[PDB]
Design a protein around this ligand. Sequence first.
Ligand SMILES: [C][C][C]S(=O)(=O)N1N=[C]C2=C([C]=C([C])S2)[B@]1([O])O[C]1[C]([O])[C]([C]OP(=O)([O-])OP([O])(=O)O[C][C]2O[C](N3[C]=NC4=C3N=[C]N=C4[N])[C]([O])[C]2[O])O[C]1[N+]1=[C][C]=[C]C(C([N])=O)=[C]1
Ligand SMILES: [C][C][C]S(=O)(=O)N1N=[C]C2=C([C]=C([C])S2)[B@]1([O])O[C]1[C]([O])[C]([C]OP(=O)([O-])OP([O])(=O)O[C][C]2O[C](N3[C]=NC4=C3N=[C]N=C4[N])[C]([O])[C]2[O])O[C]1[N+]1=[C][C]=[C]C(C([N])=O)=[C]1
Ligand SMILES: [C][C][C]S(=O)(=O)N1N=[C]C2=C([C]=C([C])S2)[B@]1([O])O[C]1[C]([O])[C]([C]OP(=O)([O-])OP([O])(=O)O[C][C]2O[C](N3[C]=NC4=C3N=[C]N=C4[N])[C]([O])[C]2[O])O[C]1[N+]1=[C][C]=[C]C(C([N])=O)=[C]1
Ligand SMILES: [C][C][C]S(=O)(=O)N1N=[C]C2=C([C]=C([C])S2)[B@]1([O])O[C]1[C]([O])[C]([C]OP(=O)([O-])OP([O])(=O)O[C][C]2O[C](N3[C]=NC4=C3N=[C]N=C4[N])[C]([O])[C]2[O])O[C]1[N+]1=[C][C]=[C]C(C([N])=O)=[C]1
Lengths: 257, 257, 257, 257
Amino acid sequence: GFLSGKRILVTGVASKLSIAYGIAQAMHREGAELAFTYQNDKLKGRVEEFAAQLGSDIVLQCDVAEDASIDTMFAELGKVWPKFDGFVHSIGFAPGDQLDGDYVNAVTREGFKIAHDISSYSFVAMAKACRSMLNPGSALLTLSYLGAERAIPNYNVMGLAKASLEANVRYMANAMGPEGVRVNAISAGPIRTLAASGIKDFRKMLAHCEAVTPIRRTVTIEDVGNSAAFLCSDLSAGISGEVVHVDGGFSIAAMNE
Amino acid sequence: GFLSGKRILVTGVASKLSIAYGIAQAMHREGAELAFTYQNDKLKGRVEEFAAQLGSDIVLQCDVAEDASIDTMFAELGKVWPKFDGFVHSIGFAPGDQLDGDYVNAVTREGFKIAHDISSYSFVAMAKACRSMLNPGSALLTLSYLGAERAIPNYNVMGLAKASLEANVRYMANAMGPEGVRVNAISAGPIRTLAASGIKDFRKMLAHCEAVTPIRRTVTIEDVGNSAAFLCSDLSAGISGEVVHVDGGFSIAAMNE
Amino acid sequence: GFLSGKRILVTGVASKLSIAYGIAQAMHREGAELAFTYQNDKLKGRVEEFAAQLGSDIVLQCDVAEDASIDTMFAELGKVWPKFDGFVHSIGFAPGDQLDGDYVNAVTREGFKIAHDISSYSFVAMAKACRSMLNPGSALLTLSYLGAERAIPNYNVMGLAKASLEANVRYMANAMGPEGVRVNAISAGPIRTLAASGIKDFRKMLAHCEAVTPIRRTVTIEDVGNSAAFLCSDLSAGISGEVVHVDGGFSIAAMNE
Amino acid sequence: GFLSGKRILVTGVASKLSIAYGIAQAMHREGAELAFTYQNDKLKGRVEEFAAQLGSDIVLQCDVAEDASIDTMFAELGKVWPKFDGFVHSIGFAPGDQLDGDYVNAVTREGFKIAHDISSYSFVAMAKACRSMLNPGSALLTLSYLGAERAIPNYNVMGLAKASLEANVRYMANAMGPEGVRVNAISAGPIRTLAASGIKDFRKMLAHCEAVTPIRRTVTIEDVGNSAAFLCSDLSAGISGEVVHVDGGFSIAAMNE
Ligand SMILES: [C][C][C]S(=O)(=O)N1N=[C]C2=C([C]=C([C])S2)[B@]1([O])O[C]1[C]([O])[C]([C]OP(=O)([O-])OP([O])(=O)O[C][C]2O[C](N3[C]=NC4=C3N=[C]N=C4[N])[C]([O])[C]2[O])O[C]1[N+]1=[C][C]=[C]C(C([N])=O)=[C]1
Ligand SMILES: [C][C][C]S(=O)(=O)N1N=[C]C2=C([C]=C([C])S2)[B@]1([O])O[C]1[C]([O])[C]([C]OP(=O)([O-])OP([O])(=O)O[C][C]2O[C](N3[C]=NC4=C3N=[C]N=C4[N])[C]([O])[C]2[O])O[C]1[N+]1=[C][C]=[C]C(C([N])=O)=[C]1
Ligand SMILES: [C][C][C]S(=O)(=O)N1N=[C]C2=C([C]=C([C])S2)[B@]1([O])O[C]1[C]([O])[C]([C]OP(=O)([O-])OP([O])(=O)O[C][C]2O[C](N3[C]=NC4=C3N=[C]N=C4[N])[C]([O])[C]2[O])O[C]1[N+]1=[C][C]=[C]C(C([N])=O)=[C]1
Ligand SMILES: [C][C][C]S(=O)(=O)N1N=[C]C2=C([C]=C([C])S2)[B@]1([O])O[C]1[C]([O])[C]([C]OP(=O)([O-])OP([O])(=O)O[C][C]2O[C](N3[C]=NC4=C3N=[C]N=C4[N])[C]([O])[C]2[O])O[C]1[N+]1=[C][C]=[C]C(C([N])=O)=[C]1
């Protein structure tokens, strides 16, 4: 496949619904060698199962709120993958009270802080921690959302955190380009999931999108997974510092009434 | 003038070179009544002097790092201006080490945190605190920079913080619009000063802009002040949630060689 | 006022509903001296009446489809205003059939051609013709619409023509900057009228904007006029090559439901 | 390969240096079945040679300045490919006098017209002509350039034409989405070519780009070809109406001094 010979780290698998599960599946189908991280003990088993299913026994814990957690994980990784070809960052967080109602009223200093720390800083923290382990030709990928570009109801402070994240992509891309490392993001559309979201009225969002999206359907984790695999392969060597919208053309239309 | 009868709070005057000084000056010329804040004791006397020069005796302290400090200030302001028409937010900060050299190597969790806290969160923290005191037809304004949209050397983490700030402008605009409050930003070009910059190689950056800027000069605090006054008046009633570039066209050109 | 002593040519007045009327009105209030053009004989008397109302007796004909017509007009204008300070370009056109239904089915080579010719080329054609007559500190302004950035139903080919127009603004800005001419555009929101629109379902489009527009109302020609006056004054000396959105924040929100 | 089973039409092969040659090579490596067009007789032989080398004997003449030319070509194509899966539009043109010096001085009504007709209209003209022949799951691709977003010296009116083109992508995407056809563009960086360009000082552009581009090299026709193959495959089913920058991160940085 087009990822044959690549060794890639995938973060944020939490369930088969997780965008990262879709990315891992597709990367694995294209031949990449995979490693996985899990945030906490309550997730370990699951992830360990999925890894197995994808031919991997590299399964490490990592909580991005902790520097030491990140250092330790790469220390362990280095035991098996002294050098590797990049990683997928599919992680985010904000306290739920932040995600419901009038932004101005909902937002708090702490909520703001946490959201940006976990959803944005973590991306460069990881890079900082594995920089010297990366091969020439490596690629880093993160998952964004249209909320970084437009004010969306209830998404609230996540919007600011994702904007911060998209700038992080540009700053990282620029800084690590010359060493041979590419950095991009995928701005995915809302993905249908029966599972309960923390974002107030997500279902409504979904329904709306299906209706006014040019391609007339919401994207799947397979759509995202396939774009992610490509952006992480040498096939996209001419692309860096880019935020690729994988939302079926949703953001480019207006008034599809 | 076109600000006649308006009452506006101006923050971040620190010197005659401060962007807010140019803003207060122009606003005062157009007939606004102003109030001033100052960060700490070292700055109090300077602010008091400028304020008198501009006909104001409302000079209050406010450190945006503290919620208590913001509340206290608005509580005191409410003594003389029980309702007002908006404020200018011309504040930012990042620890020195953050603005020199390779972004990824320079960035730290703490640095990121302070940068986003004082530079982006503070804008909404102020709005939350005085929401009830604003008149319909009120306008809020903050100062941004191109680093939010493009990766610029040495600006590093401040780049991410401004991005978050411009998203704040949109989320704030959308939330407060229906109450009749407008929220905008001005992405100002680098301004020439004799003072010294904490941003590594700022002088070089000036020299370059001057050369390739379509209007062939850097903009002044009068340029910025004039735009801010307009953005804060009833003359811009149809503009909200916008980031207006006041940089003489610099950002719209490429390779002016 | 802030336009005092300025001499500005205003094009595209056709009625009291015309955007240019709102522009001339506001500019006249701020102290500018104006001149007016009119497309053909059917419009001459209306323009003459408005012009007198606004203290001007310079009313000249100009059909932008013709180079000769542009030259002739500036030759006549030069009789009274040998040098002036810029013009407002508020002209556009596309044949009826182009603005109804499926874009791909509606578009034609001719339609495309006329649309781009009168709607985009005319802006630079005017600048080329009067370049030598402009004072340093002059400003040119054109009127755009969101259709340039997003695909909006029925706007169809005009969408492509406005995109070309906004690029014209940047190329013009960059070319004329060093001579001291500024060039900008205002991307105005849909304005409510009793008149009738050639854009299929314009009324629906209004209704929708009203609902989801952050300031909860459509903008007026006074809103636009006020912004244009500012953009054409020395107060915006640091703004060039910009497309300022005067649509009450509409474009920066999504799913205001 | 990932294009196995697809039948794709490639326009604008003129030499082995042509971006379309790079796209055809990569699509052919991924298994697509190809057809080729040539503009005029002086190009026929060459193209016929290249097609042969890529396992194709479908080689038709087509001059996009002519509607009948386009109709006739699809008539002929339909003889062998009654239905197919899309096409690559790698065509553009402007008279050379347009591409040198001050934009305002260089631009003419005719030059403007031609540039937009051949470089932009042709893209929707082709779609219009083969709409009913397209399979569900089809994709259309065009080649843009950063000049559509920023004022670039000497690129002049091509800039306006490319902006028009990028809007065409959005309008087309929106209009044909619901039938199952995707439409995107690739905004490629300047590509090194020893062959003589019509754009004044192109070499300089090249040199500059190599130096300040994050990845520190210019992209190749292989880089572009690979992105094009992906964007034309079902692998990018979640992407439509997008302008993907394939320029090594060049457009996202500033002041790489
Ligand atoms: C909201 C909040 C949160 S976040 O941010 O996460 N998110 N989520 C969800 C969502 C969003 C948007 C939307 C629309 S929805 B967001 O914002 O984003 C997202 C993210 O980033 C990614 C991924 O996600 P998903 O896949 O979806 O999910 P999940 O599965 O859940 O995952 C997550 C993860 O994370 C992790 N973490 C946390 N925390 C932490 C971690 N790790 C470590 N450490 C720490 N601390 C966990 O564990 C898990 O795994 O993507 C995104 N997106 C974008 C777009 C769209 C989307 C959808 N879904 O639709 C998504
Ligand atoms: C870098 C870091 C920092 S900041 O501030 O952020 N900044 N600064 C400078 C600069 C920049 C950019 C550039 C290019 S330069 B920035 O980033 O941004 C800025 C800001 O925001 C504004 C204003 O500034 P200016 O005026 O310039 O300055 P100053 O005078 O210094 O001011 C400042 C202020 O703040 C305050 N604070 C702080 N902290 C605090 C405060 N308050 C309260 N609290 C706390 N905590 C002080 O005090 C002072 O007063 O603007 C901006 N900009 C933009 C663009 C451009 C510019 C120039 N300059 O050029 C500026
Ligand atoms: C559609 C097609 C056409 S146009 O004009 O282009 N337009 N119109 C309308 C409209 C639009 C958009 C919308 C949304 S609506 B458009 O596109 O754009 C517009 C223009 O540019 C301007 C102005 O308009 P108004 O004011 O509205 O209108 P009127 O009054 O009709 O005016 C026009 C004028 O032009 C002239 N012309 C033509 N042709 C010609 C001329 N001149 C010379 N030559 C030639 N050939 C006439 O005469 C008249 O006066 O603005 C715009 N806008 C934007 C935005 C929004 C708006 C509203 N309206 O809403 C507008
Ligand atoms: C300039 C003028 C012209 S165009 O437009 O063509 N172009 N060219 C070049 C260039 C550009 C940009 C730059 C930077 S350079 B442009 O603008 O664009 C381009 C195009 O579009 C495409 C492709 O190209 P190439 O490949 O490069 O080239 P060639 O090879 O030459 O090819 C072309 C073609 O076309 C055709 N045609 C014409 N005319 C016609 C036709 N066909 C039909 N009909 C008619 N009429 C011919 O034949 C040929 O084949 O891509 C683009 N790009 C983008 C970016 C970058 C680039 C580079 N190169 O670098 C390119």
